[PDB]
């Protein structure tokens, strides 16, 4: 409900660098093992399912991503509108592209 900005930035960066996010359907207390952020917290701190789930709800509502639920897993993908939005929250300059376009093969 009260989400730190480090978390927002972390989620956005994870999206851009991976263009995706596959997330569990969970509502109890727990910590996501993937996306991590540092706020003087040990070496790194992991977030909580609640914050990230609220974030993702909002994003998909705005049209940034498109879900594709499955065996009780959330599969999100960022679109073009989303790219044209993530590119400015992170302060990215124009022309920059995410890694999957970087000829993985």
């Amino acid at each position: 409900v009260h989400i730190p900005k480090a978390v927002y930035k972390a989620v956005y960066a994870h999206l851009y660098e991976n263009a995706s996010l596959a997330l569990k359907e969970y509502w109890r207390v727990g910590n996501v093992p993937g996306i991590t952020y540092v706020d003087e917290n040990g070496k790194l701190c992991n977030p909580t399912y609640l914050h990230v789930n609220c974030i993702m709800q909002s994003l998909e509502s705005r049209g940034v991503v498109k879900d594709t639920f499955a065996w009780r897993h959330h599969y999100y993908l960022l679109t073009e509108k989303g790219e044209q939005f993530i590119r400015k929250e992170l302060d990215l300059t124009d022309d920059v592209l995410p890694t999957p376009y970087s000829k993985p093969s």
């Binding site: 569990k24 359907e25 969970y26 109890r28 727990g30 910590n31 996501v32 093992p33 993937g34």
Partner: protein, 85 residues
């Protein structure tokens, strides 16, 4: 209520610093990493559920499956289970 203390007699009798046995079930490492928060979900307990339809009843744990019997006949052919004999 940090300024709340108890007689020493009522302290050694307290449960030894041991991790409550109930560990829940993390079907995958992804689905976790260890006001109301004081009692949101303190009743830790096994919550084993189907990894398809999320129901807590009739779950084949044999062979590390974790699939409901109903949610099973459908996907059994894909998995490789077949009906012969």
């Amino acid at each position: 209520r940090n300024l709340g203390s108890c007689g020493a007699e009522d302290l050694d009798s307290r449960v030894h610093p041991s991790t409550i046995f109930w560990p829940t079930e993390a079907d995958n490492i992804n689905l976790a990493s260890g006001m109301r928060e004081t009692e949101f979900c303190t009743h830790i307990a096994h919550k084993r559920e189907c990894r398809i339809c999320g129901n807590y009843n009739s779950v084949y744990r044999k062979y590390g499956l974790f699939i409901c019997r109903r949610c099973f006949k459908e996907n059994a052919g894909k998995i490789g289970f077949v009906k012969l004999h």
